[PDB]
């Protein structure tokens, strides 16, 4: 599992469950092509997006569908989605966890890059 | 001044000065088109992006060019940029401040929305 | 105005108004003694806490009364308060803004420190 | 394990390793008495602070020694420590994870309360 996404809810103090997440890779013509996707588990985690073989160096966009999450809880949100855009590069045996902490009008995102 | 962006540096505890910021508005054809751009001042603020006339209802994306910012300080950061996507003026005209707090592997963003 | 506190509400996307804030300074005997207090304004800011004369070198604690804030909005939050502890003016006099962004189970705090 | 602490470093994008953490419980005379302590692991986690039997309802303070962490990396920090103060209350079968995301001039803390 070289790329994992973890989302927390800062209003309810809990994992953010069932948040849709879409990942794109930037293509040579500069458009974003679908790469992988899923919904966060009861733990607020999404595992199994990709494999070491298919996660080559390149520029990726991870879109976390925050707006639908807040709307399924009855809470008016600000953002359409949270977006995390980064270049993945080999520089040894790396695992990438993209963490996001959500509030209706605010989010933070951090990358934890290990091994 | 219906749209303002403010950026702070979480490493230095200071405003993030001279940060490039590009705003796009989603077009009829589902495309991001250029809306406005500028650079943060010595206070870390960017004023004068638009006017209440121009700033109609729409889906906007504010792209904050964080990787260029960190690179110019000798830091190789995780993200290419911070992107903030939101529907604006859909409940009538409002005033929007988009704040971002930056660290090399992390950022947060909040919107303060007032009448 | 060498010490200012600013508080935003991450649920509403607005300044956090009427938030009580108590500042203490560590005494000779290792005790926290009262230094200054106030409430945030309609802008979410608290000005006029101290003067450059009074605001000497020292270890300060800024206690932001977040639980009272959330309770008055009908939210039962996690934290009793947000506490921000720091050494001040130890490199000579500076200007300190202590910002906090609040959610019911989460907060962030940053200091912006200028000459 | 009803109380767990997890700390991330937002400048290096990694767990914050070997951060000292002290937990206090508020006593009837209103002073903080030592309750539990440890240092975060290679995963940035601290497990085994307490047991269900000894973690009764009450007010607790978790102090994360951020200043020493930044000083062992060569980075001038703002805060003396990060403090998380909260009331623990039974309301079913609860586990408390206190998460903190550190930058030199800024931190966030969230509580994830599960089961
Ligand atoms: O900790 C934060 C998070 C978001 C915005 C701010 C902030 N904005 N202006 C000031 S001053 O501080 C501080
Ligand atoms: O206080 C925060 C803010 C953003 C992310 C987190 C976090 N906690 N665990 C992970 S993984 O990420 C904690």
Author numbering:
A (entry chain A), B (entry chain B), C (entry chain B), D (entry chain A): 10 to 124
Give the article text.
Transthyretin (TTR) is a homotetrameric serum and cerebrospinal fluid protein that transports thyroxine (T4) and retinol by binding to retinol binding protein. In the quaternary structure, the TTR monomers are arranged into dimer-of-dimers configuration and form a β-sheet rich, homotetrameric structure.
The compound C1 binds in the reverse mode by orienting hydroxyl group into the inner cavity. The hydroxyl oxygen atom of C1 make another hydrogen bond with the hydroxyl group of Ser117- Ser117′ in AC site. In BD site same oxygen of C1 makes a polar interaction with main chain nitrogen of Thr119-Thr119′, besides engaging Ser117-Ser117′ through a hydrogen bond. As a consequence of the conformational difference, the ligand has fewer van der Waals interactions in BD site as compared to AC site. Out of the reported ligands, C1 has intermediate IC50 value.
